[PDB]
Amino acid sequence: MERYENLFAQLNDRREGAFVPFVTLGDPGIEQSLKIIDTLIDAGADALELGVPFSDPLADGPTIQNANLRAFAAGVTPAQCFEMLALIREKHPTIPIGLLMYANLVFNNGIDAFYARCEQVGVDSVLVADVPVEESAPFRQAALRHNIAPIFICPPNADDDLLRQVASYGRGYTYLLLHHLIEKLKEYHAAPALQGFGISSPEQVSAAVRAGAAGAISGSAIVKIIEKNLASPKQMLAELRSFVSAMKAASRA
Amino acid sequence: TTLLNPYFGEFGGMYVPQILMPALNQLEEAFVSAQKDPEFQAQFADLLKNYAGRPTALTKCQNITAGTRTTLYLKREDLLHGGAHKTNQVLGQALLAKRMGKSEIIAETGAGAHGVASALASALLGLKCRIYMGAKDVERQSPNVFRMRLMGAEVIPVHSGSATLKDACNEALRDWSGSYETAHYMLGTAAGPHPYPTIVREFQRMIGEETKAQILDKEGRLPDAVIACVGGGSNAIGMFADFINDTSVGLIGVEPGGHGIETGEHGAPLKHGRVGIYFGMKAPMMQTADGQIEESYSISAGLDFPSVGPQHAYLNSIGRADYVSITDDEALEAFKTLCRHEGIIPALESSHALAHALKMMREQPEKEQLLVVNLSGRGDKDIFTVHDILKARG
Ligand SMILES: C=C(/N=C/c1c(COP(=O)(O)O)cnc(C)c1O)C(=O)O
Ligand SMILES: c1ccc2[nH]cnc2c1
Ligand SMILES: c1ccc2[nH]cnc2c1
Numbered sequence: 001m002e003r004y005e006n007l008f009a010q011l012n013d014r015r016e017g018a019f020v021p022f023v024t025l026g027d028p029g030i031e032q033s034l035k036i037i038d039t040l041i042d043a044g045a046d047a048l049e050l051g052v053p054f055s056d057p058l059a060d061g062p063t064i065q066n067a068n069l070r071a072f073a074a075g076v077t078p079a080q081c082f083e084m085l086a087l088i089r090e091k092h093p094t095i096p097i098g099l100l101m102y103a104n105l106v107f108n109n110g111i112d113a114f115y116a117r118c119e120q121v122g123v124d125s126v127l128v129a130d131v132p133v134e135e136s137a138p139f140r141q142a143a144l145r146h147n148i149a150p151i152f153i154c155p156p157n158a159d160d161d162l163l164r165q166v167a168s169y170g171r172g173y174t175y176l177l178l179h180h181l182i183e184k185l186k187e188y189h190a191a192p193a194l195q196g197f198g199i200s201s202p203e204q205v206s207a208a209v210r211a212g213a214a215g216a217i218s219g220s221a222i223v224k225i226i227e228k229n230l231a232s233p234k235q236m237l238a239e240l241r242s243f244v245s246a247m248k249a250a251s252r253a
Numbered sequence: 254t255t256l257l258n259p260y261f262g263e264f265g266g267m268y269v270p271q272i273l274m275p276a277l278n279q280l281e282e283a284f285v286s287a288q289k290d291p292e293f294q295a296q297f298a299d300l301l302k303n304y305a306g307r308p309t310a311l312t313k314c315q316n317i318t319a320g321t322r323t324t325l326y327l328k329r330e331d332l333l334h335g336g337a338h339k340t341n342q343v344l345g346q347a348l349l350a351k352r353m354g355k356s357e358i359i360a361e362t363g364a365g366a367h368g369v370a371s372a373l374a375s376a377l378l379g380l381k382c383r384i385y386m387g388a389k390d391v392e393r394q395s396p397n398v399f400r401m402r403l404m405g406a407e408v409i410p411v412h413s414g415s416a417t418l419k420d421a422c423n424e425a426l427r428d429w430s431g432s433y434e435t436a437h438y439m440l441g442t443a444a445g446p447h448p449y450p451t452i453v454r455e456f457q458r459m460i461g462e463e464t465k466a467q468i469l470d471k472e473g474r475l476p477d478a479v480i481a482c483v484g485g486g487s488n489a490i491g492m493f494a495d496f497i498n499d500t501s502v503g504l505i506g507v508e509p510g511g512h513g514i515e516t517g518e519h520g521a522p523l524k525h526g527r528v529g530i531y532f533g534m535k536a537p538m539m540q541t542a543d544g545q546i547e548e549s550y551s552i553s554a555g556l557d558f559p560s561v562g563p564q565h566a567y568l569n570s571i572g573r574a575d576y577v578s579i580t581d582d583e584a585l586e587a588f589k590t591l592c593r594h595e596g597i598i599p600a601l602e603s604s605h606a607l608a609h610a611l612k613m614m615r616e617q618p619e620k621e622q623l624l625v626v627n628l629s630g631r632g633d634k635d636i637f638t639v640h641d642i643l644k645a646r647g
């Protein structure tokens with residue numbers, strides 16, 4: 001499919017930034033996770049970034065470490081995550097869906113097989129947190145064979161060879177983190193940039209778009225609202241709706 | 254792009270978030286530079302000799318082999334300053350940290366031997382040291398904790414996941430992402446992302462080099478086999494490296510069998526796990542059918558790890574090295590036998606290697622064989638553990 005291209009074309013028509021929340025699949029349980037995700041979309045999420053619970057999430061701070069433990073405490077498995085993703089896609093035909101994976105869950109049952117399952121349930125992209133561009137070839141090839149965008153992080157300690165590699169190898173969007181990074185990435189015809197460095201306020205979304213980013217990725221801020229409101233499901237959904245409404249409003253201008 | 258090959262056949266690599274790649278590239282160039290620098294080599298040799306006490310003895314064990322055609326030598330890494338082989342490569346890595354202009358050290362430990370070695374090296378060389386350790390591990394290793402703090406190190410317990418060595422490993426990489434301009438990550442085994450498996454081997458290879466010189470002096474020939482326990486792989490690759498091209502010399506690595514391979518409570522991923530990607534490397538893992546990393550088990554904290562260094566996976570694949578397992582009960586018997594018949598108290602980790610040598614002898618007592626066991630550490634740290642088992646069974 002072309003869900004990221006269509007979304008950016010529609011947003012560029014509207015002179016509008018993307019707002020993309022991150023949540024852990026099955027946090028705090030399968031049914032509540034599905035309700036949380038439907039609430040983010042209803043409230044104006046342009047796209048989703050969805051974590052699969054992993055035993056040793058070495059790229060995650062404590063907010064998301066705790067999100068995975070909550071999901072394991074509910075028995076959430078990779079197979080249950082693929083069932084959830086098929087249900088989300090069945091409800092929501094156009095929203096780009098990206099996964100945040102750890103390499104072992106992609107490699108476990110065979111890399112080709114992993115990306116074939118992603119394509120069957122209608123996932124758009126995969127970011128493998130512990131596969132740098134230097135190790136990426138078999139992952140990026142299997143992704144593209146199954147119409148999945150491989151997503152790369154352009155860190156702040158990036159150099160020009162890394163910018164050319166991320167620009168050539170990535171698809172869908174470039175995960176960002178002087179921010180002239182954005183102009184070089186455009187010069188190198190990179191996938192549109194989403195800024196993802198601790199985006200937790202409306203002003204940061206506006207600022208990302210003003211810098212020339214196509215939008216912003218939150219994540220942690222969303223999981224924090226889940227953590228805070230465990231004891232009140234309907235207050236959780238109210239605070240999630242208000243947060244996403246505010247972050248999405250910030251992207252129109 | 255790298256200066257050296259990050260792979261041993263299909264095993265190894267650099268499976269880290271993009272943000273850590275510059276730290277690994279910087280470390281590789283500093284290592285390649287240091288290995289060509291006679292002043293670096295001279296400073297390293299000085300510390301090994303005059304501070305750590307190298308060369309270590311090679312002890313012939315006559316009582317334990319009486320009435321068989323086995324001749325057994327022990328390579329006495331137990332006599333190194335700190336009481337384990339871990340000291341050798343901590344001294345080299347601390348000098349690399351200084352070469353790179355770093356002022357701070359991060360280290361993981363399970364048992365506490367690498368943490369003690371990192372804290373002693375940091376005290377000597379004027380580095381500020383922090384040690385991530387399983388909260389489970391902290392609560393079981395209060396001796397080695399107190400030693401680290403006496404030597405001015407910060408010991409950080411880990412609440413994350415199973416709260417153990419893999420999470421301790423997990424915690425250390427977590428920290429280095431942000432601090433690598435100022436801090437060096439002092440990885441304690443021949444595993445993790447390139448260039449650590451290579452660096453740790455080269456900073457442990459004096460074990461095998463000395464063993465080869467000493468066995469030529471004493472016996473006028475190479476050993477039939479050298480035998481070492483395998484937790485992550487550093488003492489074994491240190492003993493193996495200088496013999497890899499001596500194709501007559503057997504290389505035997507001993508993984509922990511725990512309660513028995515058939516129980517699933519073991520630490521033997523090389524022979525009983527399957528390949529995965531974790532801790533920065535493609536290597537054999539103990540993992541669930543779903544690809545979650547499993548918890549290992551051994552009576553010996555220093556072997557209790559669900560992966561293995563990629564060079565051991567490679568040496569196994571091509572048949573250059575053979576890997577076996579030894580259970581808790583076999584290790585304990587070898588521990589008691591060495592104490593009673595040679596007056597040496599071995600680390601329970603090292604007792605795995607000894608137990609396999611004793612099996613080689615006892616199974617085939619009229620086979621002529623010249624064996625060396627790497628005695629990776631002393632067993633003072635294990636006497637409470639052994640006491641507690643002996644009380645329980647009698
Ligand atoms: C894991 C640790 N110890 C490992 C160890 C081992 C196993 O690690 P290597 O496979 O890296 O040699 C062997 N012998 C001794 C005396 C040891 O202390 C540690 O000290 O943190
Ligand atoms: C979203 C959530 C967790 C992540 N870990 C690394 N990149 C991420 C993006
Ligand atoms: C692969 C193999 C050998 C190498 N030497 C330097 N970089 C390498 C990568």
Ligand SMILES: c1ccc2[nH]cnc2c1
Pocket residue numbers: 361362363367418422440441442444484485486555558
């Ligand atoms: C295996 C894994 C990590 C280690 N750190 C120190 N010794 C080790 C053995």
Ligand SMILES: [Cl-]
Pocket residue numbers: 011012015016017214
């Ligand atoms: Cl726009």
Ligand SMILES: [Cl-]
Pocket residue numbers: 167168169170171189190191
């Ligand atoms: Cl592109």
Ligand SMILES: [Cl-]
Pocket residue numbers: none
């Ligand atoms: Cl010589």
Ligand SMILES: [Cs+]
Pocket residue numbers: 318319320321322323324
């Ligand atoms: Cs003998």
Ligand SMILES: [Cs+]
Pocket residue numbers: 483484485508509520521522556557558559560561
């Ligand atoms: Cs092991």
